Design an enzyme around this catalytic site. Structure first.
Site, short mmCIF file in Angstrom:
data_model
loop_
_atom_site.label_atom_id
_atom_site.label_comp_id
_atom_site.label_asym_id
_atom_site.label_seq_id
_atom_site.Cartn_x
_atom_site.Cartn_y
_atom_site.Cartn_z
N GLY A 23 -7.86 68.47 23.90
CA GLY A 23 -8.41 68.05 24.12
C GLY A 23 -9.40 67.39 23.26
CG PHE A 25 -15.06 65.47 25.05
CD1 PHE A 25 -14.67 65.44 25.98
CD2 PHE A 25 -15.14 64.22 24.14
CE1 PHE A 25 -14.05 64.45 26.67
CE2 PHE A 25 -14.82 62.87 25.53
CZ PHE A 25 -14.38 63.43 26.41
N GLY A 26 -12.82 69.05 25.17
CA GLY A 26 -12.51 69.82 26.58
C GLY A 26 -10.78 71.14 25.51
CD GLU A 27 -12.03 76.60 25.52
OE1 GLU A 27 -13.40 76.25 25.82
OE2 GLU A 27 -11.32 77.92 24.91
CB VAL A 28 -8.12 72.39 29.23
CG1 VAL A 28 -7.77 72.01 30.94
CG2 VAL A 28 -9.15 70.61 28.65
CE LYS A 43 -13.86 68.19 29.55
NZ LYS A 43 -13.45 66.22 29.88
CB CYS A 94 -2.33 68.18 38.29
SG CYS A 94 -4.17 67.48 38.92
CG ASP A 137 -9.90 59.27 26.33
OD1 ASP A 137 -8.96 58.15 25.93
OD2 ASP A 137 -10.26 60.01 26.42
#
Lengths: 326, 252
Positions: A23, A25-28, A43, A94, A137
């Site tokens: 996503g 602003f998200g490198e998970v 994150k 999760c 969101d």
């Protein structure tokens, strides 16, 4: 030399595994505590340019996650450093997300299980709203489920706090928020004094998405969206939506005038239960001030009909031992 | 938990700075000096006292983990403030905060070339420091201050406007001059502020219709005996502070 740091552990104490969500602003990554095998989600705080020190929107997110401690809201465990430097947000891992499940065809939901999902999702909204937070969101991708079938709202990157707008000064929140498809009409018409109802809309788009297995209103741009919506809910008029004229984009956006509410009908084929339909309906209401709220939604007969909400654990395990994510 | 940033008298004695040659007295002044620097800066940058206080708390807590001999007050303050500003919804631009910090610490010298390597380095230097601050604080940046309860604590004894004002002054000076905020909860400090404010204004708070003193309505853990000890320490350092007491002195 080195500096004392008692309250910020190095992220080395976690062993990276696999990139699970890409996503904005998200490198998970997923990760494993090198000592307890405890699974977590990492994150990494993007710092693309950030020529103003630590990213403020990051500080915002961080303040919010710390404030929201609830069973249906994702859990921030701590924050970790790298020793340029890097900062990592660490959450409880999760195993699935609603997007991964709805798309995978090997997955099927009974009416009662679906009831539990929505019950969990609406309860989580009730919480954050009660804490004056807007999620901004809403989309299946941001709805997770643990191995034990617990639904958790996630990604508060866009989330922000909201206030009681009196004293004769309406709020100026940001307008271009929430993904296109799950975005509500108030925002498209350029509202800047919106509230909780914007997440409720999202919640609507998800309900349907539970039976249709696919985001119900996919639009190319903000104009193609607004039409697509009106082609389901009806035409935007002061008759159905009082004072909707005041928006500078009302018909200054060439809105389609001839449309009548075709929501229940267009959905009957997918969702059978009359109660479920009636809910999806009061959620996808055009006028935000006439759209159903978290509290009332829970008290809806849907959550209290013969097929009572069930627990999910049995399904998840029996179903697949793998974690559904893009 | 919620006791991490509260310490014992012995803990304050054996600070990080003590273990590097710094006398208790020396150290306490480093704090006051940093606070002053902050107060000054914040005024110039035009931020709320709330923000300046948050900065001051960050600074206090920080030096319960780090030593003055490794981090000079003068370098930590601007970073602390810079951070406080963003945190409190009054962001100030990085250059803007460096400029103001410069003129406060070197009222004579002129700002270096904003294109030079010298300047660019003190810009990187501040970002680095703000990082170290964040990490040292374990990213726990939400702060609560006596002033929140002292508006509510004065309303609770139906105080005069003057007595209220006076209370805030105590409140704010308590932050600059003492380490109360590292020892006692914001509610408590508020009581100490109001108690002393009465004693100074020769104001007598009436005992409840029950027999309960006013402070029991705020923080049960508060005993007159304590209030008397704290108000004594607070007044003592206030008296040593030039012109300070003058600001609340009745001259008529």
């Amino acid at each position: 030399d080195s500096v004392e740091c008692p309250f910020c552990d190095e992220v080395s104490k976690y062993e990276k595994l696999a990139k699970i969500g890409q996503g904005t602003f998200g490198e998970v990554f997923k990760a494993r505590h090198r000592k307890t095998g405890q699974k977590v989600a990492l994150k990494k705080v993007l710092m693309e340019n950030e020529k103003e020190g630590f990213p403020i929107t990051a500080l915002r997110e961080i303040k919010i996650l710390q404030l929201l401690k609830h069973e249906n809201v994702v859990n921030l465990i701590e924050i970790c450093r790298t020793k340029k430097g890097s900062i990592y947000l660490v959450f409880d891992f999760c195993e699935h997300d609603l997007a991964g499940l709805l798309s995978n065809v090997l997955v099927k939901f009974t009416l009662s299980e679906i009831k539990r999902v929505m019950q969990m999702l609406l309860n989580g909204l009730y919480y954050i709203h009660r804490n004056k937070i807007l999620h901004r969101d809403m989309k299946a991708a941001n709805v997770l489920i643990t191995r034990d079938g617990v639904l958790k709202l996630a990604d508060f990157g866009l989330a922000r706090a909201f206030s009681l707008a009196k004293n004769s000064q309406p709020n100026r929140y940001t307008n271009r928020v929430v993904t296109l498809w799950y975005r509500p009409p108030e925002l498209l018409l350029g509202e800047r004094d919106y509230g909780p109802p914007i997440d409720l809309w999202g919640a609507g788009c998800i309900m349907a998405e539970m039976w249709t297995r696919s985001p119900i209103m996919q639009g190319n741009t903000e104009q193609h969206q607004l039409a697509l919506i009106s082609q389901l809910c009806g035409s935007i008029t002061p008759e159905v939506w009082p004072n909707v004229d005041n928006y500078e984009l009302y018909e200054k956006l060439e809105l389609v005038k001839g449309q009548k509410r075709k929501v229940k009908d267009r959905l009957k084929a997918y969702v059978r239960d009359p109660y479920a339909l009636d809910l999806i309906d009061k959620l996808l209401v055009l006028d935000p001030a006439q759209r159903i709220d978290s509290d009332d939604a829970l008290n809806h007969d849907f959550f209290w009909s013969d097929p009572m909400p069930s627990d999910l654990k049995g399904m998840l395990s029996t179903h697949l031992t793998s974690m559904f994510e893009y | 938990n919620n006791k991490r940033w509260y310490f014992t008298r012995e803990q304050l004695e054996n600070s990080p700075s003590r273990r590097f040659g710094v006398d208790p007295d020396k150290e306490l002044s480093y704090r006051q000096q940093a606070a002053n620097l902050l107060q000054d800066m914040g005024q110039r940058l035009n931020v709320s006292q709330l923000t300046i206080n948050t900065a001051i708390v960050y600074m206090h807590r920080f030096y319960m983990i780090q030593s003055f001999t490794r981090f000079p007050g003068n370098s930590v303050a601007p970073a602390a403030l810079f951070l406080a500003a963003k945190v409190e919804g009054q962001p100030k631009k990085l250059e803007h905060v460096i400029k103001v910090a410069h003129t406060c610490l070197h009222p004579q010298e002129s700002l270096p070339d904003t294109r030079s390597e010298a300047y660019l380095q003190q810009v990187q230097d501040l970002v680095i420091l703000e990082s170290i601050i964040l990490q040292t604080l374990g990213f726990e940046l939400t702060i609560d201050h006596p002033h929140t309860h002292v508006v509510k604590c004065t309303q609770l004894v139906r105080a005069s406007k003057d007595l209220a004002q006076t209370s805030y002054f105590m409140a704010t000076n308590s932050l600059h001059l003492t380490t109360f905020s590292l020892q006692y909860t914001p509610p408590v400090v508020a009581c100490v502020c109001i108690h002393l404010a009465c004693k100074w204004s020769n104001w007598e708070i009436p005992v409840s219709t029950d027999g309960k003193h006013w402070w029991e309505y705020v923080d049960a853990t508060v005993t007159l005996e304590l209030l008397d000890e704290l108000t004594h320490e607070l007044l003592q350092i206030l008296e040593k502070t030039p012109n300070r007491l003058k600001r609340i002195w009745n001259w008529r």
